[PDB]
């Protein structure tokens, strides 16, 4: 019974991990950045170089 | 800061777009048609008063292909627009109206007369629908394919000014496809129940004639009103079912590709196979069609080639680098790619030819209005408006001295 | 600290703090000019010395001084909060002119000195309360009804339909039917008692002709109601003939389509592809959209109207009347929303037009 | 390439969200607000 429970838990853990990874990818899908800061907007911030 | 209290009106062949300058999308979009009842235009205006069945009410269109057909009905359309949708008395807001390039100059004069004299708006301006459609995409050098219900046209614009004589007009438009699907209905016998009577949904499986009942309270409706509503139903059919072949229509390919399903208002449902691919080929090749198939009929690729050719090579390369497709008919599924291949064959690919990407319903229909919104809020453009005190003589002399 | 969620209804003003589940302060959007100035909570009590104005007609602000006073009351009396220390989330009817949004931003930042502001569409906030990525929102508010299709949270302005009957004119029609009953209700107090009668009694019937037959055959529909004057009346057939006016505006005498028909129209106006998803997600919001059985009547109506092939689902949570405020609270509590506020700097440099640059 | 003169996107790095966003170019919208545009370049994955 303990072996069966351990194997079943391994499969449940694997499935939950795959589901969490799918949810994380779905999270990544949305555009992570929409705005920036003001001191990083009107002070030239960078050169192409 | 470049904005003023400007309203952009864009009345095409199907719907009137009213919105404020700077707005991303038109505020309202309700159809060109309008109701009538016995005494003047005792009335019904938008999609909410134009649809409830009524005792012998008749529906007409003050517009035709964009030219005004009844200025009193046009005035009442505008009055209701201002009264409800924009709900601001017009005495303060600058307005710019879009007119089809082929609309008569005298009609522009009479439109200005009506606007200024009656509605007493404090400023005005005119700019053509094709000009505004190219205005939306930010391109000086552009070629526009406008195709609504009643007319399909191709017009080039350079330096923001239309090549006024370079206008191509083709009735192969939304109404062409609508007539084609109408004769389809007749040939395979769709009985077009209007949605406004149905009160039950005893639906049936594929092909079977669905059962239903008509609401007892219904009063008599003039034939024009029923015609309009069933025309809207078949317009929905146009949007849903029609699809365009990538290449020249073929029977075996058209049969091979999976069929599609459409259900009618009463529960009657049917599956379409090769006919939906065949129908737009009629636009791309009028010859195969019934009746409307004479050599006089000009298809989309031939239209673009004719419009491009009639202008000299000092701007034709500019037209090459951007082909812009707008209007309703361009929304038939896979129409734009078919047009692109069609021009790639017709127009020698030897020089730089690009399309300009624009897909959604907002971007095609309202690109005529979006350009007007872009102009109205433009900083330099604020000097161009026809003022009332200017209008006193401008409505006659400067409505042309100013608005090319 | 907390963000202030002030929802400006068409006769009912709702206020509270971001993150709270319900609007703590609810007071009618009344303002009265003596025959000082007083707002609903005290204005409704001061009628004898007062003449009552409404600053919101059909969800669009009528005049700005009265609305200024409504906001002054909201903050300083109802919430007791300092506007200078809290961000303010304002909700305005769909299809509000540009000038009105700009004036709202101006009033807030100038007169009330708010640090951060946002103006959001009421229907989109009701969708947020429902919690659906795409949907069609039927918001029969306090003075106007709006059918708003929303795709990916973006309201499609072209398809939004306005029908100019809702709770208030419905109450007026109930006053008509109640005079037909033989009673009399004309005064403002009597009108409010009819309002209470509407809240307590009426319902949306599942079948009109059937319920006429039932009322004729059976007296069970009659229920008793107690008036402030002390007498008692019975309401039967009226319990649904007035709500029935929603789907047949001809009962009101108005010459427009009904609620379900207008929902069909709005759905049609949208792109064909997303019509199925809108069908699957229909949200009933607003004050007068919470009649009992209204959801099922809608369900049957637009099952009949819509293609039988597409599953229509009516979503009407039990507290849909506040759904706009709950959506505002959810939006203001989000960490991702915090980047969307309009700051004092942004108004100072860009002016009232800033409301259109980042706040649709 | 074709040498278009206006589509001058470039690699850029912000300061507060300090990362290489990829091809982005700066623009002034209405109201004098400086906006960074962007491309969904096929290099998108390389910027880990
Ligand atoms: N999905 C669709 N695909 C193609 N055409 C459609 C679709 N849905 C509706 N239509 C029809 O296409 C036309 C929509 O364009 P519309 O007539 O409004 O153009 P417009 O901007 O007014 O220009 P024009 O001056 O050419 O009339 C109408 O005939 C409408 O019935």
Summarize the structure.
Chain B is α+β, with helices and mostly antiparallel strands and 404 residues long. Chain B has helices at residues 71-85, 105-119, 129-136, 174-188, 223-241, 251-256, 274-284, 300-310, 316-320, 335-346, 361-365, 367-376, 388-394, 398-401; strands spanning 7-11, 15-20, 28-31, 34-37, 42-44, 58-60, 63-64, 67-68, 95-98, 123-126, 142-147, 152-158, 161-162, 168-170, 260-263, 269-272, 323-325, 386-387. Chain D has strands spanning 10-13, 20-24, 26-28, 34-36.
Can you offer a commentary on this structure?
The structure is cut from a larger assembly and holds chains A (49 residues), B (404 residues), C (360 residues) and D (48 residues). With 49 residues, chain A is mainly α. Chain A has one helix and no strands. With 404 residues, chain B is of the alpha+beta class. Chain B is built from 14 helices and 18 strands. In chain B, strand 1 and strand 2 form a beta hairpin. In chain B, helix 4 crosses helix 5 and helix 8 packs across helix 10. By secondary structure, chain C is of the alpha+beta class. Chain C has three domains: 158 residues, 2-Layer Sandwich (Nucleotidyltransferase, domain 5), CATH 3.30.420; 108 residues, ATPase, nucleotide binding domain (Nucleotidyltransferase, domain 5, 2-Layer Sandwich), CATH 3.30.420.40; 92 residues, Actin, Chain A, domain 4. Helices cover 39% and strands 21% of the residues of chain C. In chain C, the strands form five sheets. In chain C, strands 3-2-1-9-10-19 form a six-stranded mixed β-sheet, sandwiched between helices. The longest helix of chain C has 16 residues. Chain C is globular and about 70 Å long. The two termini of chain C are 25 Å apart. Chain D has 48 residues and is an all-beta fold. Chain D is flat, with a radius of gyration of 12 Å. Chains in contact: A-C, A-D, B-C, B-D, C-D. Chains A and D meet through loops of A and strand 1 of D. The structure holds adenosine-5'-triphosphate (ATP). It is classed as gene regulation. The entry lists the keywords complex, chromatin regulator, gene regulation.
């Amino acid at each position: 019974a303990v072996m069966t429970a351990v194997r079943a838990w391994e499969f449940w853990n694997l499935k939950t991990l795959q589901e969490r990874e799918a949810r994380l990818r779905l999270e990544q899908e949305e555009a992570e950045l929409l705005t920036y800061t003001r001191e990083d907007a009107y002070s030239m911030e960078y050169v192409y170089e | 800061g470049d904005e003023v209290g400007a309203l952009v009106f864009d009345i095409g062949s199907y719907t009137v777009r009213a919105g404020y300058a700077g707005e991303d999308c038109p505020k309202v979009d309700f159809p060109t048609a309008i109701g009538m009842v016995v005494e003047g235009p005792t009335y019904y205006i938008d999609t909410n008063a134009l649809r409830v069945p009524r005792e012998n009410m008749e529906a007409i269109s003050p517009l035709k292909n964009g030219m005004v057909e009844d200025w009193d009905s046009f005035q009442a359309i505008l009055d209701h627009t201002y009264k409800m949708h924009v709900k601001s008395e017009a005495s303060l807001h600058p307005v710019l109206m879009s007119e089809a390039p082929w609309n008569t100059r005298a009609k522009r004069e009479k439109l200005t007369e009506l606007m200024f004299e009656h509605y007493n708006i404090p400023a005005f301006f005119l700019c053509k629908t094709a000009v505004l459609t190219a205005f939306a995409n930010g391109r000086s050098t552009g070629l526009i394919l406008d195709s609504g219900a009643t007319h399909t046209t191709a017009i080039p614009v350079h330096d923001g000014y239309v090549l006024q004589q370079g206008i191509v007009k083709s009735p192969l438009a939304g109404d062409f496809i609508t007539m084609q699907c109408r004769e389809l209905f007749q040939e395979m016998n769709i009985e077009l129940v209007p949605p406004y009577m149905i009160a039950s949904k005893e639906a049936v499986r594929e092909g079977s004639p669905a059962n239903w009942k008509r609401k007892e309270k219904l009063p008599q409706v003039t034939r024009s009103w029923h015609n309009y509503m069933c025309n809207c139903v078949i317009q929905d059919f146009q949007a849903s079912v029609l699809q365009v072949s990538d290449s020249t229509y073929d029977e075996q390919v058209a049969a091979q590709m999976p069929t599609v399903h459409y259900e009618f208002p009463n529960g009657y449902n049917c599956d379409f196979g090769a006919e939906r691919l065949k129908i737009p080929e009629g636009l791309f090749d009028p010859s195969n069609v019934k009746g409307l198939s004479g050599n006089t009929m000009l298809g989309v690729s031939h239209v673009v080639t004719t419009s491009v050719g009639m202008c000299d090579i000092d701007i034709r390369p500019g037209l090459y680098g951007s082909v812009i497709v707008a209007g309703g008919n361009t929304l038939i599924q896979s129409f734009t790619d078919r047009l692109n291949r069609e021009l790639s064959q017709k127009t020698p690919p030897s020089m730089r030819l690009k399309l300009i990407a624009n897909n959604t319903t907002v971007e095609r229909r309202f690109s005529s209005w979006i350009g007007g919104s872009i102009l109205a809020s433009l900083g330099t453009f604020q000097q161009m408006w026809i003022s009332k005190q200017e209008y006193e003589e401008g409505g006659k002399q400067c409505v042309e001295r100013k608005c090319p | 600290i907390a963000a202030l969620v002030v929802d400006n209804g068409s006769g009912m003003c709702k206020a509270g703090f971001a993150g709270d589940d319900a609007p703590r302060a609810v007071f009618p959007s009344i303002v009265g000019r003596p025959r000082d100035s007083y707002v609903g909570d005290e204005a409704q009590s001061k009628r004898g010395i007062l003449t009552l104005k409404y600053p919101i007609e059909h969800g669009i602000v009528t005049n700005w001084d009265d609305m200024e006073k409504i906001w002054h009351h909201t903050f300083y009396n109802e919430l007791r909060v300092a506007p200078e220390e809290h961000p303010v989330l304002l909700t305005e009817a769909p299809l509000n002119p540009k000038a009105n949004r700009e004036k709202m931003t101006q009033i807030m930042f100038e007169t009330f000195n708010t640090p951060a502001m946002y103006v959001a569409i009421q229907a989109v906030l009701s969708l947020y309360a429902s919690g659906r990525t795409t949907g069609i929102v039927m918001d029969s508010g306090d003075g106007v009804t709006h059918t708003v299709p929303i795709y990916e949270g973006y309201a499609l302005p072209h398809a939004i339909l306005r029908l100019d009957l809702a709770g208030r004119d419905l109450t007026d029609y109930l006053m008509k039917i109640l005079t037909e009953r033989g009673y009399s209700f004309t005064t403002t107090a009597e009108r409010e008692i009819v309002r209470d009668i509407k809240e307590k009694l009426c319902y949306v019937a599942l079948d009109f002709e059937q319920e006429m037959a039932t009322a004729a055959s059976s007296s069970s529909l009659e229920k008793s109601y107690e008036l402030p004057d002390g007498q008692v009346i019975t309401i039967g057939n009226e319990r649904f003939r007035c709500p029935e006016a929603l789907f047949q505006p001809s009962f009101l005498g108005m010459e427009s389509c009904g609620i379900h028909e207008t929902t069909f129209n709005s759905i049609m106006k949208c792109d064909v592809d997303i019509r199925k998803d809108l069908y699957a997600n229909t949200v009933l919001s607003g004050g007068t959209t919470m009649y009992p059985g209204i959801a099922d009547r809608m369900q049957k109506e637009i099952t009949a109207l819509a293609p039988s092939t597409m599953k229509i689902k009516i979503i009407a949570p039990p507290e849909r009347k506040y759904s706009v405020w709950i959506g505002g609270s959810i939006l203001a509590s989000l960490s991702t929303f915090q980047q969307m506020w309009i700051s004092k700097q942004e108004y100072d440099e860009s002016g009232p037009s800033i409301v259109h640059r980042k706040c649709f | 390439g074709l040498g278009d003169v206006r589509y001058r996107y470039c690699l850029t790095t912000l300061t507060v969200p300090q990362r290489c966003i990829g091809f982005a170019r700066r623009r002034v919208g209405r109201g004098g607000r400086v906006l960074l545009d962007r491309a969904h370049s096929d290099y998108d994955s390389v910027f880990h």
